[PDB]
Structure 1
Amino acid sequence: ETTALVCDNGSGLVKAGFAGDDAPRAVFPSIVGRPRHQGVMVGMGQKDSYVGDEAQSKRGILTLKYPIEHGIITNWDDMEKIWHHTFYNELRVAPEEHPTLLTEAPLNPKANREKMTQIMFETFNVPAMYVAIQAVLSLYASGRTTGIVLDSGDGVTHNVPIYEGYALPHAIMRLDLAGRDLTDYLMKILTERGYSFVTTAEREIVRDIKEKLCYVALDFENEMATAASSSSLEKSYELPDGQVITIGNERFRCPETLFQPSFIGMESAGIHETTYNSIMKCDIDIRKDLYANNVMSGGTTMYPGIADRMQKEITALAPSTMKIKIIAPPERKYSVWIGGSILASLSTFQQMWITKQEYDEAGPSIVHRKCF
């Protein structure tokens, strides 16, 4: 009778809703805004914060902080604010009569999962809660059992291969390059055309520019030459104060950092090389099945050139007698949540919850013996 809750707390956005649905009810940015130190506006008699859409709407007098940096929860009071907002203000529900499903990226600290269990059981006290790996949920939403998931969000980009339901943790790869780094790089490279975005309120404007106008080139040098030749790749964007800006090659130079990290000074390899290295660290008899089942998930995979570019690069790296298939569904931005709704709806999952009695008896360490 009790409906289960599915909550996905990424580095940048929170996607929360009810199990059994098709789309999340509440999708809001994972930011906490605090008063600015300029004494311009002191008349707003609040408590001490604004969270979510309210912080974004009032961002002209606020300083915005992200509670999660590179997939790791760094501030826990702000995380409590986010969870309180998504329980009482967005979903409009009382947490004491709904089980909760939470998500976590691979190769995270154990303390993060332990404190998630502790906060969900001692402050927002739920009958049961369960923590799951995001790539397993993405594979659940994709409908298949074997595949390698490239999950790229706002803080991390990780590759996880799974064969017939068994995961290989020694081949799990993690790269600290995601959407926020691309936003910072776009802020850096818009200064070449004379536009100056500095403050955190303008970072959201640059993020909107990136979400609306950027794309991944199939060949980088040819598209750079084409942009240098003619102004056919140039697009115009209207700022909130009515100013109009024009951008050219910056549309495709920004996501190219995902394939050439040295643009921002990182020594690592691109996502295609990382995926190929993750495939090569597995056993020889499963690589063929991983080749045909490259699954893309996350909001950073939403550029309209990335599947063809990934296919071209991986086909260049892999032997010529292999079928390389990139699986990029249109609803892949919320695949983790969709998988969570799938997982929370199974009749065979209802005995795997962690009840409050078990948490009382064992403490905040049963999350390793119960959750993968």
Structure 2
Amino acid sequence: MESAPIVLDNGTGFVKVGYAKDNFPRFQFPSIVGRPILRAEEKTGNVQIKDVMVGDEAEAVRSLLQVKYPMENGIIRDFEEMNQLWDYTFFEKLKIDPRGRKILLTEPPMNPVANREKMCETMFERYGFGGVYVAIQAVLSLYAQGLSSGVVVDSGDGVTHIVPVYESVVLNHLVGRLDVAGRDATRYLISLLLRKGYAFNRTADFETVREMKEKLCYVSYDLELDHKLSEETTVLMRNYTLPDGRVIKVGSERYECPECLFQPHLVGSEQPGLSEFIFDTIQAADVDIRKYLYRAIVLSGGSSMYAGLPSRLEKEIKQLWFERVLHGDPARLPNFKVKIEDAPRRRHAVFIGGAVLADIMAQNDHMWVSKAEWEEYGVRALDKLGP
């Protein structure tokens, strides 16, 4: 294929993988590992299950598997299962020998140091990569825009994180985590459907409500209007057929599920939701740069894909500036400019930006942490990878 640097978005819900200059993931698959189970469920001779089965091999066959996730909240929870994802990623998805290759990895901005350390150790000491770079996921989503300033908010399966950038300087003191994302919204959909008498407690059923959420949920633009369509009308009602063949009815849960991003208290969090987390972040930036951050609020990651989320977010920031800056005086509201950037490709902006950055540093061999540098400095070799 090519001698290029490999780029790997080892995300909490999905792995995405490919090479420098790729305009889209070469492969993308669930970051899941499966073990064989029997469960008072259908069985046939038309398949065979190995003692470890992962990614697409697990997701297509998950009725037969104990499904587990090697990651949660942007951190590796189990490196023994993460080793099985990385084996699968290199040896039977890419079908590559890692020996002496250079690889670009990704993580969110406020992880434990042990996550990056043991992840780089694994690249040098299981796979024998010749060099590694680890990039902050949301600065890659800005490389995908071809853009040097704006506040970039990335919401995936594990974490929602925000990174203000101005004139290519990253405002590291302003970066933050909202510990609500696509998995919390999926756990909330299970909780809301449980009030309707449905049950989804099997490890294989989490991917079923993920696909249901991803098909049927949307962000209410106006809560009292969606509550009116919900309580006065049947128009929000929708049928979903599970891979069982069972049919379930879903109504208010379609707007009530993703509302936990804009109202985290619905999932028990005390943090402010997306609009107020983004506003408190921009409003903490210096006076001379606030306008440039409001004129480029860059959305990223799969949990930014709910229908109406850009519309609600733009409105709710105008509405929050009107409360907290103008104190309810209409006369200056038309002068406040905000622009949500909401590209079609934005679920993959971290990969697409990693494929840009990995090309920009492909020839600059000193930019990567080397295997020869790792084996003499250990974890102190990673002090190259920013502050």
With normalisation by structure 1, the TM-score equals 0.95
Aligned ranges for residues 1-372 of structure 1 at < 5 Å? 2-36=3-37, 48-318=51-321, 319=325, 320=333, 321-346=335-360, 349-371=364-386
Question: Are the counterparts in 2 of residues 291 and 323 from structure 1 also a CA contact under 8 Å?
Answer: yes
Q: Which moved more, 1:224-233 or 1:346-355?
A: 346-355
Q: Shift of residue 58 of structure 1?
A: 2.7
Aligned pair count? 371
Question: Are the counterparts in 2 of residues 154 and 300 from structure 1 also a CA contact under 8 Å?
Answer: yes
Per the alignment, do residues 248 and 39 of structure 1 end up closer, same or farther by CA in structure 2, a change over 3 Å counting? closer
Q: Which moved more, 1:345-354 or 1:84-93?
A: 345-354
Partners of 1:249 and 1:16 lie apart in 2 by: 36
Query: 1:80-110, CA deviations, whole angstroms, 9 ceiling, x for partnerless residues?
Result: 1111100011111111142110001101111
Query: 1:169-210, CA deviations, whole angstroms, 9 ceiling, x for partnerless residues?
Result: 221111111111111110111123332222121211111100
- Letter paired with 2:104: L
Partners of 1:265 and 1:355 lie apart in 2 by: 43
Question: Are the counterparts in 1 of residues 98 and 127 from structure 2 also a CA contact under 8 Å?
Answer: yes
- Letter paired with 1:183: T
Q: Shift of residue 309 of structure 1?
A: 0.3
Q: Shift of residue 284 of structure 1?
A: 1.4
Query: 1:305-362, CA deviations, whole angstroms, 9 ceiling, x for partnerless residues?
Result: 0001000010112253321000000000100111011111126744312222222222
Partners of 2:358 and 2:140 lie apart in 1 by: 11
Q: Which moved more, 1:99-108 or 1:61-70?
A: 61-70
Question: Are the counterparts in 1 of residues 216 and 254 from structure 2 also a CA contact under 8 Å?
Answer: yes
- Letter paired with 2:11: G
- Letter paired with 1:258: L
Question: Are the counterparts in 1 of residues 6 and 18 from structure 2 also a CA contact under 8 Å?
Answer: yes
Partners of 2:303 and 2:104 lie apart in 1 by: 23
Query: 1:121-173, CA deviations, whole angstroms, 9 ceiling, x for partnerless residues?
Result: 11101121111111111111111101111111111111111111111222111
Identify the residue that residue 329 of structure 2 maps to in structure 1. none
- Letter paired with 1:158: H
Partners of 2:107 and 2:9 lie apart in 1 by: 8
Q: Which moved more, 1:295-304 or 1:259-268?
A: 259-268
With normalisation by structure 2, the TM-score equals 0.91
Question: Are the counterparts in 2 of residues 6 and 340 from structure 1 also a CA contact under 8 Å?
Answer: yes
Note the aligned Cα RMSD (angstroms). Answer: 2.0
- Letter paired with 2:384: R
Q: Which moved more, 1:105-114 or 1:193-202?
A: 193-202
Q: Secondary structure at the match of 1:150?
A: strand
Q: Percent of counterpart pairs with the same letter? A: 47
Partners of 2:64 and 2:380 lie apart in 1 by: 42
Partners of 2:40 and 2:380 lie apart in 1 by: 46
Query: 1:40-95, CA deviations, whole angstroms, 9 ceiling, x for partnerless residues?
Result: 88x99866321112222332232211111111111111111111100011111111
Q: Shift of residue 241 of structure 1?
A: 2.7
Question: Are the counterparts in 1 of residues 134 and 385 from structure 2 also a CA contact under 8 Å?
Answer: no
Q: Shift of residue 239 of structure 1?
A: 1.9
Q: Shift of residue 28 of structure 1?
A: 0.5
- Letter paired with 2:23: D
**Which ranges in structure 1 are unaligned for 5 or more consecutive residues?**
none
